[PDB]
Design a protein around this ligand. Sequence first.
Ligand code: SF4
Ligand code: SF4
Ligand code: SF4
Lengths: 51, 156, 43, 176, 110, 314
Amino acid sequence: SDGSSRPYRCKIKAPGFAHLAGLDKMSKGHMLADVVAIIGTQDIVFGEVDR
Amino acid sequence: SRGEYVVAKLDDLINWARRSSLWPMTFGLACCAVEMMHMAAPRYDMDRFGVVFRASPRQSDVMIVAGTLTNKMAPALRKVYDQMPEPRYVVSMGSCANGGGYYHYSYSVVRGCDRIVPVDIYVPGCPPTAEALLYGILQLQKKIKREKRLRIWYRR
Amino acid sequence: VKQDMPPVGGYGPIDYKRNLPRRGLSGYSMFAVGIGALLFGYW
Amino acid sequence: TYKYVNLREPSMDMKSVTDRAAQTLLWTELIRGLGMTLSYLFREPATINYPFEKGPLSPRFRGEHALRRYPSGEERCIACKLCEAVCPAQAITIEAEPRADGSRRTTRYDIDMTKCIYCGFCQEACPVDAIVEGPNFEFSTETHEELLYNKEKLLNNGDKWEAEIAANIQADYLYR
Amino acid sequence: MNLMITLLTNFTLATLLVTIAFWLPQLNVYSEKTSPDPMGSARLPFSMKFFLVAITFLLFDLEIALLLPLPWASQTTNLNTMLTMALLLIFLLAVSLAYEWTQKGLEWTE
Amino acid sequence: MFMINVLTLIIPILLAVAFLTLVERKVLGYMQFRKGPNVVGPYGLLQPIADAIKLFIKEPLRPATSSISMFILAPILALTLALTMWIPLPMPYPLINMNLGVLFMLAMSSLAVYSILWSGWASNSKYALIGALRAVAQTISYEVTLAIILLSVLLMNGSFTLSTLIITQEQVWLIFPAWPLAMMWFISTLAETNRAPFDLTEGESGFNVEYAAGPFALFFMAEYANIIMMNIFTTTLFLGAFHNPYMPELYTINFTIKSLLLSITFLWIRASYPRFRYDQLMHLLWKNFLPLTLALCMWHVSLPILLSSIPPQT
Ligand code: SF4
Ligand code: SF4
Ligand code: SF4
């Protein structure tokens, strides 16, 4: 806040943004059908991932 | 005459067959997809109308654009619409698909999905309720019911 | 004043534990039933 | 203040291991799932008969917008532009001028129903309860420009839905 | 003659249905589409596992063909020899299965 | 006169599979706390007719197939082997009474995979080819286990004639001496027709996605006819009914009720379990089903010898 009635900067940290970065690490050595469970076992909503 | 009556009854038959077996292809983009799945819930139950749940885009009739169409996403939507068999219809659900909504003035949001695909039914809301989307689907069924393809073919 | 408040005695108990019923016969009895059906069929 | 989910050591005696072997040789838990689904078949489904039956709603519901009137015919809005200043989506456009009798009245009141997020800030910022969000939600159109309401459309909506909007306001206004 | 008539009837109903499904909406008037899948530019890489399970199926199918006439063969007079040969055939089938098991033959398509 | 018999065999198959689609939708819906179609007709009885007329007037896809001969021929073979495969069924009298009806049905079961193979090859997408290869591998593996189970059960029966199975089950059912074979046969027929939880093309591509609405409908008819006939085959093989030579309608009603219950059990299994992985179903066959199949095959070879229970050849 800069003292006015509007925010100067509003950064939104989402839990799903950091979880999706680890998808490449967690899915290493697994099958193609095991990947869709990993994207399921991390509750990923793309409204908060992309903001 | 005889031919006008015959083509009228045939048009009514094909209209009933097309409107009573709608197979939708949703677009799970944003909030409005969650409300769509709430319409597919046992309380409202689209499936009792003949409207199946999560049909394949290669065999679907109507496309439901539920969410915000961004600049990075619109060519994929146009590709999906171009790879859909006729007769096809597009239903815009929510403010984002109608006119941008909250993100109308954003740099990366397409202000309405009517700039990419032709839209038959506009469902307003944010999110429009499951009753509202069901009402829009029923209104699309009424719009299909009063089609006059064979009458135009015979008259031309 | 009139406000949305809980009743003066409080609400009733609410269960929240996992409750699997633990139904059914044991392994010995199930296997005995299987061999009995096999023996009747063979006879 | 914490519990250990999935930290159970199964018994290694003959009875429990024979129960486990019978479970994986005779499909006990698959029969349990089948019995669950079969029991759920004989329950009454929760499917309502739309449009002959409607879902339950509260008098706080935010649907289609409308412009109200006083109980004398005079419209409530006095062109104070609070709703267009508080609208987060900038869906409201207001232009005003004094009319023939000198009252402060609007000459243009447009609400872009494709921009509006249906948040109800306009009806809570109105000092005279002029603009309201009515209970109507079955108002889907077939053309984009039909969702661009002007002052005449909102006045027609108010005159159409006053008999329900007044009752909803009467039932709700004590919580505001 | 009855079996040939039934086969011809099933075949002609199938091709009538295929012709109707492939040609009835062709007479309708519509608009054409351009000539344009995740692997369009990439070539198909060979996988040894699918070919291995194919040949395993073929060999087990051949031993199934050898094992098949047992219902006719159970009515013989050399019952000891028939029982010994049947048990030997199934034992050799199980030995082949166990040897494929031990040498990591059923890997990633188990 | 015989063509009347052929038509009365083959037209109720199409009616039964259309109303099987309706029954599947209704029974699946009622098992998850909602209703099925009840708006189009009285309790949705007009739903399959509307679906058929909708699917037969949709615009065909016209894919860019590498070959058009295989693209045409795959529905031809699929429908032909779906409808030909009903004829040796003893309900209680077969259309064609053959000495080796079981071997005939097994031969058409082995032959039915060419529709999948040609559909995968004709589509220009190589992902569809990969999916078709996986489906073919699954079908041939469960073909192997079907053949061994059928061999052991017929060794109990004593002949390949399908009508003899009614005679050999006059006293007691064959599910009583052969319930592990019954369970494994049921799962194998479930996995043969790409039925849940063994379908793969729906989950993460299909081999028949490139087909038009009409050919997709024909593939659907072939698959559902295979499902109904496989349930009828299981009913005849394990759960045979009481047959009176003076009133065949008793046997007809009885095995119709049993096969209807088995088809409802198929839909019931569809709405209870998550999908298998491909390697998991390979593990289920090659490491679990096959050793037990070979052991029970040895047991059923040796059991009539040591019990003086050898059935007659005729
Ligand atoms: S219209 Fe509203 S509810 Fe729908 S996607 Fe946009 S922000 Fe979400
Ligand atoms: S409900 Fe909210 S977004 Fe809609 S007009 Fe009122 S203030 Fe604007
Ligand atoms: S807040 Fe009320 S009185 Fe003020 S301009 Fe808006 S509708 Fe009119």
